[PDB]
Swiss-Prot record:
Function recorded in the entry: Inhibits host translation by associating with the open head conformation of the 40S subunit. The C-terminus binds to and obstructs ribosomal mRNA entry tunnel. Thereby inhibits antiviral response triggered by innate immunity or interferons. The nsp1-40S ribosome complex further induces an endonucleolytic cleavage near the 5'UTR of host mRNAs, targeting them for degradation. This inhibits the integrated stress response (ISR) in the infected cell by preventing EIF2S1/eIF2-alpha phosphorylation upstream of stress granule formation and depletes host G3BP1.
Subcellular locations according to the entry: Host cytoplasm
Residues in CoV Nsp1 globular domain copies: 2-113
Residues of the full protein shown: 11 to 125 of 7096
Domain of life: Viruses
Protein name: Host translation inhibitor nsp1
Taxonomic source organism: Severe acute respiratory syndrome coronavirus 2 (2019-nCoV)
The organism's taxonomic lineage, starting at the top: Viruses, Riboviria, Orthornavirae, Pisuviricota, Pisoniviricetes
Region described as Disordered: spans on this chain: 1-113
């Protein structure tokens, strides 16, 4: 399927144990997509002071359209040293590995895969 319904656990930035997906734009997009397929991906909501506490390159989920079955349609955009790889809508959050952190909420998304 071109899209997959996921429910992503929303993590507090200070709880995250693994603060990025890897060391290059191509690697972090690859690993993010793998962890989304495997159900091992969390979401951190972006506010003042959040991104400097995480590791670059960043992977964002961004709104791709204006929401089937309560799932916002999203796609992946990476960022490294202020350059983005991909073009999309509003940021819903930054993706990180999930390794058993307790979430505060869930974010229903339809991931363009």
């Amino acid at each position: 399927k071109t899209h997959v319904q996921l429910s992503l656990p929303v993590l507090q930035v200070r709880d995250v144990l693994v603060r990025g997906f890897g060391d290059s734009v191509e690697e972090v997009l690859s690993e993010a997509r793998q962890h989304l397929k495997d159900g091992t991906c969390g979401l951190v909501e972006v506010e003042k002071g959040v991104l400097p506490q995480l590791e670059q390159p960043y992977v964002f989920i961004k709104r791709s359209d204006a929401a089937p079955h309560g799932h916002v349609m999203v796609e992946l955009v990476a960022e490294l040293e202020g350059i983005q790889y991909g073009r999309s809508g509003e940021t819903l959050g930054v993706l990180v590995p999930h390794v058993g952190e307790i979430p505060v909420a869930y974010r229903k998304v339809l991931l363009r895969k």
